[PDB]
Design a protein around this ligand. Sequence first.
Ligand SMILES: Nc1ncnc2c1ncn2[C@@H]1O[C@H](COP(=O)(O)OP(=O)(O)O)[C@@H](O)[C@H]1O
Ligand SMILES: Nc1ncnc2c1ncn2[C@@H]1O[C@H](COP(=O)(O)OP(=O)(O)O)[C@@H](O)[C@H]1O
Ligand SMILES: [Mg+2]
Ligand SMILES: [Mg+2]
Lengths: 245, 245
Amino acid sequence: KVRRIALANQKGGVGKTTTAINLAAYLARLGKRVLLVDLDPQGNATSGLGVRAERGVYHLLQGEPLEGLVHPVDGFHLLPATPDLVGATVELAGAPTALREALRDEGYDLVLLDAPPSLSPLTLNALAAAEGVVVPVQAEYYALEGVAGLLATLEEVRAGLNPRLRLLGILVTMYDGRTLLAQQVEAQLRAHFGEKVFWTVIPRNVRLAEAPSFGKTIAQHAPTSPGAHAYRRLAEEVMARVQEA
Amino acid sequence: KVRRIALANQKGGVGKTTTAINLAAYLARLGKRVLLVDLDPQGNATSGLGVRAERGVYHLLQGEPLEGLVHPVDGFHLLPATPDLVGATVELAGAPTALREALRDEGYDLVLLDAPPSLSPLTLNALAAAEGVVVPVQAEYYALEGVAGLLATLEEVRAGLNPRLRLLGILVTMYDGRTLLAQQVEAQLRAHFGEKVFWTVIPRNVRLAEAPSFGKTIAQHAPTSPGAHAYRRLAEEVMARVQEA
Ligand SMILES: Nc1ncnc2c1ncn2[C@@H]1O[C@H](COP(=O)(O)OP(=O)(O)O)[C@@H](O)[C@H]1O
Ligand SMILES: Nc1ncnc2c1ncn2[C@@H]1O[C@H](COP(=O)(O)OP(=O)(O)O)[C@@H](O)[C@H]1O
Ligand SMILES: [Mg+2]
Ligand SMILES: [Mg+2]
């Protein structure tokens, strides 16, 4: 039974936050009760949703109620990141299951954990608290190694911290349609990882890059753009995999 | 073991020929030996590939060799339709398994049967000779009924003519990205038919409409266009389903 899904990988700039935000947008639209949790001190998901918070995840880990920390956004709830969050890293280091205990998210159908571009204690807290992992990757050649490494990390976390942890899927993001290289990398990703790679692929599209600067999801910003259609179908695909898991 | 795949549905103009041609283009590129068989008297696949034939399927059914009837096209082989083909309809009516016997296609890995926009004896011959069926549909509201009817036809052919017959998949084609209606119809198609609907969806795109008028596949005509990327991924998805079947 997959409820909590971590968005994670080694690198930054690979589409974790974009996928977190827009999956939430379309899963809410599918009639699910969704909580988006921003675990990045840089607070990109919080910012990309137009929200300025004084209280967030930091304050959840200290004991303050979930209900009075969340912000209603585009038909879902955001548990924001605040500029304080950085000061939990040292405590969470040595306490990988802290988020798992602090998350009393019984009311929500699906919980999206937007992890930072590290394997920091916050990323590890994400992995330890989740049942599913979506791994965004560019259709670029380094992705095969990056993926294999992440998969080995997942295996290690499953063996030592969280036996519920499973790869939901590898998601190809920022697929550049102007070039044949993306085709070739996608084909190799599928050749090597098979059914683990989602069939839905997220196009590189200006409207997706634009959306966070406006503090809006792609469903609010550009609902008929190539990225909107893709994330809507991805939400359907994610639900199919959750249902079959 | 799925080798022969029919492209079929009730209506015309829904993307059977386009899918036949472009699947062949990308399956050949995947290293498969592909035969495309044009079963439409109007010969749209033959024309869309730039080929003018005097001899084709009509002459295959009379007994003339397969090797001397096929035309090399874009890394695959086309068994063309000729303006005579119409004169087999009456003989094939009452002989649904005629194509099944006449196809001595042992050498080919995959065989694509492009059926006419009917349930003519030629379409029935296609169904009787195939192991898999791809059903192209527009993301438009009539599709749900059209699909259900085709599925009932498939069930009947499986029960009476061809126990090997199975739906490979329902393919959403000519998905118009300018509108939210296509999203809604896709979602309903998935709600109702589930895993039977391919995840890869073919965008409505000018370059795809253009290609047959040039007698070229989308891989020849516009290799980085939205339709090219989609058909390449569809070929991968079709192979996945063939392998898991
Ligand atoms: N499909 C896409 N097309 C175009 N730009 C994208 C796409 N996905 C992400 N971006 C942009 O790339 C930058 C990094 O994306 P982000 O999702 O924050 O990556 P991560 O969270 O993994 O570091 C952001 O400015 C984002 O808007
Ligand atoms: N994805 C698409 N985008 C734009 N035009 C398309 C697309 N698919 C098919 N067409 C066009 O629609 C017309 C009918 O398509 P076709 O594949 O011949 O349908 P069918 O064989 O089912 O009758 C053709 O002119 C074709 O080029
Ligand atoms: Mg991020
Ligand atoms: Mg046709």
